[PDB]
Design a binder for this molecule. Structure first.
Ligand SMILES: O=c1ccn([C@@H]2O[C@H](COP(=O)(O)OP(=O)(O)OP(=O)(O)O)[C@@H](O)[C@H]2O)c(=O)[nH]1
Ligand SMILES: [Mg+2]
Ligand SMILES: [Zn+2]
Length: 471
């Protein structure tokens, strides 16, 4: 016996779960208009479910083809991924000016999916691994944000694109790239006065030291000796050179530096990114990566589900629904429980970043280019069956009432096991739809999802189930 409070009105409590459901269904059908209809329509298929898969096998397979096509869109080839790597290296040069032992870790979808489309935000993590081991990372993040911000501004980042978020729960920097070639690796130095012969050698030397033996291709001064342009070997070398702190001879002679062109610039200037100082996202993405790579159809299905979850509205964190991260776990959990992929123990992904090698997310093509057409058609069938099974599993198979979506153990996880079988009623921590976070303990990814919210989710799961059987 326990309390059950509604989330659609502040004055409704019951002592059973069925009553809380009936309540929402009755006097809150406006919040969940299609739940009752789609459910009834979906329940008619259940007794003849295998006959339906038989009859609609061609449609299912065609959906499988569409899944690999949609997935192929977010896979822009190894060269496009390598643009993210160079941007990562360029950022590392910048942040090391602020803290020499800091390194830049990419995390997020590029890690998870092993591809990058060229548009989706890149997540940057800035960590001193040594200090993290000592338990002294990150520093005061409000101060770190303003410091790196000012470092980026001086290397040419405009306030138009650079948004410091110093006062947030997790202080970050967000770069919002604008919408649009030897000049991309070319920079200009603006001096506040004329440079002597000795001054000019000192500047060039500071630059030459910044990039090494081959780093500089050419250098030229204007006729007033107050401007020096430089062409470096690479876009990354161009940011390296721009990060040099020159010690000139002439007193009060200072320099300003920026890319030679306003639009044609190193990778970092041209990509949206979020910069944070915590390592929480690194271990996460690595876990997701290992899972999603253990099956040829795992990443295409994940990509499709993410899009569906956003369009259907079940992926919407600002309003208290699931995140894309949570959707992946739903997908992976289903894969695990139905034997599509082997169980991965979350603890078997190292928490420490000491032995870390994969700063640059390894590239893995969305589909093996060298497979046969017979094999490719098999994957289409497989992808279709798997996506359909997902919506079937969560519509009819998974016990939303008493179980938890969890990758923390290979077997069933009950709500009771996590102590999620009761709610603290006095905007509570909801336990209607439960997804366990693999590394944050006692955190439900569905904690903002009350009963009416939950039924809206159930609605969309029914809808997608019905969708994949029809042309
Ligand atoms: O609750 C969370 C959410 C996110 N993350 C970390 O953030 C990374 C990004 O997870 P997101 O949910 O932000 O997915 P996404 O960036 O691919 O898609 P959108 O934002 O466009 O919806 C994840 O890979 C995970 O490492 C967490 O660690 N915990
Ligand atoms: Mg995100
Ligand atoms: Zn109510």
């Amino acid at each position: 016996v326990r309390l059950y409070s509604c989330d659609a009105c502040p004055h409704a409590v019951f002592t059973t779960h069925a009553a809380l459901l009936a309540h929402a269904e009755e006097h809150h059908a406006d919040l969940l208009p299609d739940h009752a209809r789609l459910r009834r329509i979906a329940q008619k298929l259940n007794p003849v479910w295998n006959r339906a898969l038989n009859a609609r096998r061609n449609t299912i397979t065609s959906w499988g083809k569409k899944i690999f096509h949609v997935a192929a869109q977010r896979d822009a080839g190894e060269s496009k991924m390598q643009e993210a790597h160079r941007a990562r290296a360029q950022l590392e040069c910048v942040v090391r000016r602020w803290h020499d032992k800091a390194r830049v870790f990419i995390f997020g979808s590029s890690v998870a999916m092993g591809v990058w489309d060229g548009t989706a935000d890149i997540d940057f993590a800035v960590v001193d691994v040594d200090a993290m081991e000592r338990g002294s990372w990150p520093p005061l993040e409000k101060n770190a944000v303003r410091s790196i911000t000012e470092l980026l501004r001086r290397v040419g980042f405009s306030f138009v694109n650079l948004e410091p978020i110093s006062h947030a729960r997790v202080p970050i920097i967000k770069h919002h790239a604008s919408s649009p070639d030897v000049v991309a690796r070319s920079i200009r130095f603006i001096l506040n006065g004329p440079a002597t012969r000795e001054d000019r050698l000192l500047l060039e030397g500071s630059v030459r030291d910044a990039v090494g033996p081959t780093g500089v291709q050419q250098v030229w001064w204007n006729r007033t000796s107050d401007m020096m342009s430089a062409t470096l070997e690479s876009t990354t070398a161009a940011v390296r050179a721009a990060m040099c702190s020159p010690a000139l001879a002439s007193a009060s002679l200072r320099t300003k530096v920026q890319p030679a062109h306003d639009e044609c610039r190193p990778e970092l200037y041209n990509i949206d990114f979020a910069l944070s100082f915590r390592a929480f996202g690194i271990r996460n993405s690595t876990l997701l990566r290992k899972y999603l790579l253990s099956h040829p159809c795992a990443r295409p299905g994940a990509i499709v589900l993410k899009d569906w979850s956003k369009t259907s509205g079940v992926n919407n964190s600002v309003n208290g629904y699931f995140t894309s991260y949570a959707i992946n776990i739903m997908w992976i959990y289903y894969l695990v429980q139905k034997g599509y992929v082997p169980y991965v123990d979350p603890l078997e992904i190292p928490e420490s970043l000491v032995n870390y090698t994969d700063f640059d997310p390894r590239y893995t093509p969305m589909i093996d280019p060298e497979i046969t057409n017979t094999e490719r058609e098999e994957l289409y069938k497989a992808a279709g069956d798997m996506l359909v099974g997902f919506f079937y599993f969560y519509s009819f198979e998974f016990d939303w009432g008493h179980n938890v979506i969890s990758l923390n153990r290979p077997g069933i996880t009950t709500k009771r096991m996590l102590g999620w079988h009761v709610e603290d009623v006095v905007h509570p921590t909801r336990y209607e739809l439960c997804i366990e976070d693999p590394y944050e303990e006692n955190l439900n990814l569905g904690r903002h999802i009350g009963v009416t919210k939950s039924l809206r989710v159930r609605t969309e799961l029914y809808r997608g189930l019905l969708s994949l059987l029809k042309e």
